[PDB]
Amino acid sequence: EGEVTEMTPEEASTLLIGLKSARGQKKLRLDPSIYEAIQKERVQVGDVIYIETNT
Amino acid sequence: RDEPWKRLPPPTVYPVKEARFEKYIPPQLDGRERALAQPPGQVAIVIDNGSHSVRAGWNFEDKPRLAIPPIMSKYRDKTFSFAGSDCYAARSHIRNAFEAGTGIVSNWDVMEHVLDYVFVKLGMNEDMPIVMTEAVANLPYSRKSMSEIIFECYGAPSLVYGIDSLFSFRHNQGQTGLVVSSSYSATHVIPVYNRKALLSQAIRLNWGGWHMAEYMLKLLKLKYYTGFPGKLNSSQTEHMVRDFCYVSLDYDRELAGYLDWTGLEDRERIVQYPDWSKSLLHAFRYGPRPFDPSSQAETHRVHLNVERIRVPEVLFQPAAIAGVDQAGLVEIAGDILCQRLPSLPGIQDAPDAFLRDVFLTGGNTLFQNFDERLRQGLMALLPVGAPLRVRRAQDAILDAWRGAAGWACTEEAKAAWITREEYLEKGGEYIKEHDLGNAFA
Amino acid sequence: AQAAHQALVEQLDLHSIHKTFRNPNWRPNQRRNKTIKAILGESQTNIESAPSLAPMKHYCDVTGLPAPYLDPKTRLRYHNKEIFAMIRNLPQGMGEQFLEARG
Numbered sequence A: 001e002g003e004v005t006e007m008t009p010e011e012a013s014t015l016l017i018g019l020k021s022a023r024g025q026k027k028l029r030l031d032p033s034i035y036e037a038i039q040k041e042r043v044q045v046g047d048v049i050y051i052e053t054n055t
Numbered sequence B: 001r002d003e004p005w006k007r008l009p010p011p012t013v014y015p016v017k018e019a020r021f022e023k024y025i026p027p028q029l030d031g032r033e034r035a036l037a038q039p040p041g042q043v044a045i046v047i048d049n050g051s052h053s054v055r056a057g058w059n060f061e062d063k064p065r066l067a068i069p070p071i072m073s074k075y076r077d078k079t080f081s082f083a084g085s086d087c088y089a090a091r092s093h094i095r096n097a098f099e100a101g102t103g104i105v106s107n108w109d110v111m112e113h114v115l116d117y118v119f120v121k122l123g124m125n126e127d128m129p130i131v132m133t134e135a136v137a138n139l140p141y142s143r144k145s146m147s148e149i150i151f152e153c154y155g156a157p158s159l160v161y162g163i164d165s166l167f168s169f170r171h172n173q174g175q176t177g178l179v180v181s182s183s184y185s186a187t188h189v190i191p192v193y194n195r196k197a198l199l200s201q202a203i204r205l206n207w208g209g210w211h212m213a214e215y216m217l218k219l220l221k222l223k224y225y226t227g228f229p230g231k232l233n234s235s236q237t238e239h240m241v242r243d244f245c246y247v248s249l250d251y252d253r254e255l256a257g258y259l260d261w262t263g264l265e266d267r268e269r270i271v272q273y274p275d276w277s278k279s280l281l282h283a284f285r286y287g288p289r290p291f292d293p294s295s296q297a298e299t300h301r302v303h304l305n306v307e308r309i310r311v312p313e314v315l316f317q318p319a320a321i322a323g324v325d326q327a328g329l330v331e332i333a334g335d336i337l338c339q340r341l342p343s344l345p346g347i348q349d350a351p352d353a354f355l356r357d358v359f360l361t362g363g364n365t366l367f368q369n370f371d372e373r374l375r376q377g378l379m380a381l382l383p384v385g386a387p388l389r390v391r392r393a394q395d396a397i398l399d400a401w402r403g404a405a406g407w408a409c410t411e412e413a414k415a416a417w418i419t420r421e422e423y424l425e426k427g428g429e430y431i432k433e434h435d436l437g438n439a440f441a
Numbered sequence C: 001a002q003a004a005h006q007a008l009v010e011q012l013d014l015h016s017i018h019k020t021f022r023n024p025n026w027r028p029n030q031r032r033n034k035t036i037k038a039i040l041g042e043s044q045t046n047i048e049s050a051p052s053l054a055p056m057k058h059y060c061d062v063t064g065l066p067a068p069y070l071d072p073k074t075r076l077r078y079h080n081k082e083i084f085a086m087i088r089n090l091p092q093g094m095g096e097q098f099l100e101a102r103g
């Protein structure tokens, strides 16, 4: 759970997402197929999201 | 319905604590007799040039001798020109040595008489070194004029300028941290890396205790709208802020349900001076008790509900409450910790070192729940797992003097003095580059 | 009766005590006691103040409660209809003082 801090495409692919909570933010490296599931949803700058890591 | 004010208890009221005089004139001469008994090189007079309270004393003690405002007043009927706390705030021709709103001295005809009162009440009948504080990133003309008043008017062996918050850092036995000091004129944030201030990237917020007092005066001027029969001085509003304001932990939930009727009798703080149950404006101005019947000891009252948590909140949300177009304290601290210090070459660990000791120095800090708000803000900004430990100094308004007291007679201070012939040769704006003072020019 | 007050005014004085250490050769200059604008004009440090760029939560400026909507006539944030009534019937010369206290 948490608020998106940045949407940074690293390679030119892998896109880091910082998930800010009320206890601290945390970097997160995404697969280039889970990002095409984030991107179908309309997540832009500071939307709170709920990423399942496993499924 | 008579229920909401039938079983309501009688009020517990607090009087006005206006900054009046106090009946003391000591000509203390017992300090020079102890100062002339010590060996040379270990005697120096330390003056904290504070904007709210200039302090002065000798370095071999723990408490300062003189703690006066920079108030002077001169007039005539024989000419009286006394200064300091001897002014009663019943004649006031008061003008201050500091410019109103900024800790940069630009009223030198007042500062000369304030230093005159200091050297008289310490005892000078005749040449000691001077360690003196200043503000961060001081203007060169002010330092030139202060050095000219020290050498030419009085006659001194040497003086050295320093930042008082960094002296309180050096007395608190820290090595590397993020000194956040909320003073009377401005709130500084200074990162310190191995006993050295990184003054190329320190940030001052332009808010302070004087701004607290003036903004509290404006909100009590606009709250009591139809005319309040009473003299609304700035200093009595400052003493209201000193003992009736606290930084709230979770602000947007505390604020919106603050003026509810159920329990307003314990939130409200009331101040003397020498239908209605539906509207909130009666609860906002007057309280859950009924209206003022225009009595003697009823019209001359000031009620405080929102001003307890609205005025000390401007340090964190400045652009909305008071319209100062700058950033909050949490956002400045996060900008320095997360975006500048990892991008600076020459230092090893940006989160693992500066977060070991974040402590709070200045006088505008002794509010209930102020360190916890900053700790929750930095916990919301920093990555998970950083060992954050925010604390405060031991003697927050007096450690700025004690830090320069302990520093005054060491080898680094001896290698940073400016003697009289160095002032005669190098000029006026000469800077011994010490790790506490400003950058050399 | 006022002799004690007169003695308190007399003993609290600077000219009553002779200046045994002030240098009489020094003379003060007239071009002092300036402002920050004048000193910054002399030198043309103290430009380390930084603004912000973020959404601000706008509160009321009559009371301190959170207020979500303003006015066209006077541009005041206000909480509910009692504060709107007191805004629309306030005497002139104060509706600018609320924006002066806000900025």
Ligand SMILES: Nc1ncnc2c1ncn2[C@@H]1O[C@H](COP(=O)(O)OP(=O)(O)OP(=O)(O)O)[C@@H](O)[C@H]1O
Residues within 6 Å of the ligand: B049, B050, B051, B052, B053, B103, B135, B164, B183, B184, B185, B186, B209, B210, B238, B241, B242, B243, B362, B363, B364, B365, B366, B367, B396, B397, B400
């Ligand atoms: N017990 C207290 N609770 C809250 N605030 C207090 C308390 N005691 C003092 N203060 C505040 O501390 C402020 C004085 O701070 P201080 O005189 O140490 O600043 P300063 O060192 O003169 O500032 P500068 O270094 O800019 O000159 C006053 O505004 C006062 O409101």
